[PDB]
């Protein structure tokens, strides 16, 4: 019983985290096998955030241009290249704590744990979801650029998040270990904002499910509803469309609770227009988003 | 900036949880030196469960009835006792991941990580406070029995719980690592229950300066307040009273957001007077109470281990 926001173990890929320095920056980079991977901002000069070139900045350094230390040791550096907006640095030892891993490109609405680290030390783990403006709403300082954002079902660490950057709202932005950025943001000094964000439906509707799970079901009422009622409302509360794909996922933790999909939907259009009424839900007294339909089955086995 | 739930990184604790077996019981210990902690409780079966005599239950195992099971090695038992409510296994290796560790026994008010664990093997990591009634709102499923808490400084490692047993709310009771309990409950099926909770006053305070330091401002005010006055406020409200020692230990945040503790505590006692008004503090719309003073310093200042 109980329901907590829950990270997975960190230990994987805290063996994973070294501090880049280039010049007078330093952030975190992650050690996988013989490959260094870091923001390609850590070239970035002080004089010029606004509109740098990263070839022309990359084609001007040298291997020891670049300093990685991992613990106590310094890593020789012996080759680089840019992969979109990640710099992978060759060294010429592999990390012997190196795990199994993929990479994996996430949707909004996915959930994974992030590890916030310092000059290539760990301060703390939390849990994050891909928000669907393509930020996440992280807890970074300056320099945690480099931290990863990662899920380990099955003992495999999926790879899915590397930190860039904060925006003006205090939110943050980022890439897949292939560098590409999540939504339409740029690693470089400019007016970009996050747009409007809004509320991840299915995750709202299986948190739901958990509550029930976890013994209470106070929020229920007598009524369904059709799919397309249903978001014609929710979007009234800049809540995002829930899908026929959303309906099926949510299958599972329907059929174990006894609650039609589209009857939680009508429990769900219910508290919009009420609130709680002094009530909570999970200890909670607005309704949670950062969970999926796979969280809840795991958290609640 | 952001401020998020955050539990300590749990990679040296990780490498020290093993599944500890007793007839058809399986739970997690914890394997430090050449020795598992694990919940004595173990060792009683379904009939025992109700009026377990602990002392003839060991006297009357011997050290093939525990297996240890470290991943995929067994772990040779060569020894057995008790401490309090924690068994104690001798086994013929060191672990050679031991972490710097230490044994504490934390207040309540204070925060710690947990390291859920199933037949020994890490599943997740979470954040919780010890309640003011000596309850963790914890996440735990059967079989979770054995999991822990810790806090690290540096690189030592605190530990601070072990899991033993769920309370009939859904709430959770567990030990220090010497298998003192917190709280009045005992390691048998009886009738037991949490009593009534208190908010952790200290920790609402040090959250508020986290949203202040945020940027979130729209509850402060121009007045301030005498500890007398707010504790009979925290009296009607169940809060823990404030003590002098609290506004010290506060006393840091008060001096960086230009709030005084008693300023921050006018603050609370007119939200708790009058409510939030519909709006939220840091995503929240109820107060917070299991971030310490430490915790808000750590998380918004970077600290690494
Ligand atoms: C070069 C580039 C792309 C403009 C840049 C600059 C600085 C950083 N930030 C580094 O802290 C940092 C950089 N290198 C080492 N640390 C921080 C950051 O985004 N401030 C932004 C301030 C507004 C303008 C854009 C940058 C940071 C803060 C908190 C959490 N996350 C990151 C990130 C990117
Ligand atoms: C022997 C004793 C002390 C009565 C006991 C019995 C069972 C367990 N529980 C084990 O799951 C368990 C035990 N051994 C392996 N697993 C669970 C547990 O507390 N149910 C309680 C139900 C009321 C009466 C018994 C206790 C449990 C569930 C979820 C989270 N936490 C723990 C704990 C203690
Ligand atoms: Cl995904
Ligand atoms: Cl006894
Ligand atoms: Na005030």
């Excluded at 300093?67 to 992978?88: E, F, P, T, Y």
């Amino acid at each position: 019983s109980g329901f907590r926001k829950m990270a997975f173990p960190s230990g994987k890929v805290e063996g994973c985290m070294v501090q880049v320095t280039c010049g007078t920056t330093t952030l975190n980079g992650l050690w996988l096998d013989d490959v260094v991977y870091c923001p390609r901002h850590v070239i970035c000069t002080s004089e010029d955030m606004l509109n740098p070139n990263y070839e022309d900045l990359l084609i001007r350094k040298s291997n020891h241009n670049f300093l990685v230390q991992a613990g106590n040791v310094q890593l020789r550096v012996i080759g680089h290249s840019m992969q979109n907006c990640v710099l992978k640095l060759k060294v010429d030892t592999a990390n012997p704590k190196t795990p199994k891993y993929k990479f994996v490109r996430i949707q909004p609405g996915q959930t994974f744990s992030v590890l916030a680290c310092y000059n290539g030390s760990p301060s703390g783990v939390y849990q994050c979801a891909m928000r669907p403006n393509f930020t996440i709403k992280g807890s970074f300082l300056n320099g945690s650029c480099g931290s990863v954002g990662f899920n380990i079902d099955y003992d495999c660490v999926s790879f899915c998040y590397m930190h860039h950057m904060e925006l003006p709202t205090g939110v943050h932005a980022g890439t897949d270990l292939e560098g590409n950025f999540y939504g339409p943001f740029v690693d470089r000094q400019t007016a970009q904002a996050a747009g409007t964000d809004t509320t991840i439906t299915v995750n709202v509707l299986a948190w739901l499910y958990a509550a029930v799970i976890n013994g209470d079901r106070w929020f229920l009422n007598r009524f369904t509803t059709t799919l397309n009622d249903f978001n014609l409302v929710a979007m009234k509360y800049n809540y995002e469309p829930l899908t026929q794909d959303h309906v099926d996922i949510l299958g599972p933790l329907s059929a174990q609770t006894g609650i039609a999909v589209l009857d939680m939907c009508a429990s769900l259009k219910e508290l919009l227009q009420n609130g709680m009424n002094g009530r909570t839900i999970l200890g909670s007294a607005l309704l949670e988003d950062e969970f999926t339909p796979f969280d809840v089955v795991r958290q609640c086995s």
